[PDB]
Design a binder for this molecule. Structure first.
Ligand SMILES: *[C@@H]1O[C@H](CO)[C@@H](O[C@@H]2O[C@H](CO)[C@@H](O[C@@H]3O[C@H](CO[C@H]4O[C@H](CO[C@H]5O[C@H](CO)[C@@H](O)[C@H](O)[C@@H]5O)[C@@H](O)[C@H](O[C@H]5O[C@H](CO)[C@@H](O)[C@H](O)[C@@H]5O)[C@@H]4O)[C@@H](O)[C@H](O[C@H]4O[C@H](CO)[C@@H](O)[C@H](O)[C@@H]4O)[C@@H]3O)[C@H](O)[C@H]2NC(C)=O)[C@H](O)[C@H]1NC(C)=O
Ligand SMILES: CC(=O)N[C@@H]1[C@@H](O)[C@H](O)[C@@H](CO)O[C@H]1O
Length: 171
């Protein structure tokens, strides 16, 4: 039993819109004579041989679980990627947080189209407003931060909203 390799998302958002870029990175030990990495998507080997797997323009079928293995590691745990269709997407680095952790939320527009007059909502109520698009940080989460979140804004002069994301805070 060798240590597990680990997959990381860069940037950290596990939910992305179609046409976003995503890099999966593998961390694991290599034997000197074998510097190659094996990648899996949906439990099937894929064609990347490098420690980074780059998705230049995400599509719905890039969704699923990824795993990787290096020559001196065991197969990593799966990391899930969700590719969504929409004009707006509420992004988070995960959906489960422990009390007192920081929560970084982002209202992301398709193709980074310019967005303004952004509201973040929790449980159907306005929670934070920004005249200009800005991320939303909860520096120290409490049980009061559990709920259904979404965001809304103006693209040009049309209102758009994102779908909701459940965020759960644990003890
Ligand atoms: C690896 O495994 C993973 C599984 O883990 C697999 O991922 C699945 O891949 C399949 C195949 O592509 C996916 O199925 C497709 O989903 C397409 C997108 O569906 C979402 O978006 C729809 C459109 O979005 C709306 O977005 C906003 C709304 O807020 C707004 O812009 C509009 O309303 C716009 O319409 C949306 O309608 C759809 O909602 C339905 O489905 C969800 C559940 O997914 C349900 O909750 C809703 O109530 C509603 O029923 C969904 O949110 C979808 O477009 C596509 O369907 C059309 O295209 C196919 C083309 O093949 C047609 O055949 C089909 O008849 C439709 O015309 C299809 O359904 C599936 O969702 C993935 N599963 C996930 C992500 O968990 C990967 O493919 C695997 N990869 C590999 C390489 O093996
Ligand atoms: C890596 C990748 O792109 N996989 C799928 C491909 O298997 C499928 O044929 C195509 C059809 O939309 O969608 C995508």
């Amino acid at each position: 039993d060798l240590p597990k390799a680990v997959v990381f998302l860069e940037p950290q958002w596990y939910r992305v819109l179609e046409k976003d870029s995503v890099t999966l990175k593998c961390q694991g030990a290599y034997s000197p004579e074998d510097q190659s990495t094996r990648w899996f998507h949906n439990e099937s080997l894929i064609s990347s041989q490098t420690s980074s797997y780059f998705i230049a323009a995400a599509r719905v079928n890039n969704s699923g679980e990824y795993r990787c293995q290096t020559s001196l590691s065991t197969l990593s745990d799966p990391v899930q990627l969700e590719v969504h269709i929409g004009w707006l997407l509420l992004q988070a680095p995960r959906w489960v947080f422990k009390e007192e952790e920081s929560i970084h939320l982002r209202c992301h527009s398709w193709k980074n189209t310019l967005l303004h007059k952004v509201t973040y909502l929790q449980n159907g109520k306005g929670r934070k407003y920004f005249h200009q698009n800005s991320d939303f940080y909860i520096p120290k989460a409490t049980l009061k931060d559990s709920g259904s979140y979404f965001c809304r804004g103006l693209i040009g002069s049309k209102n758009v909203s994102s779908e909701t994301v459940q965020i759960t805070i644990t003890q």
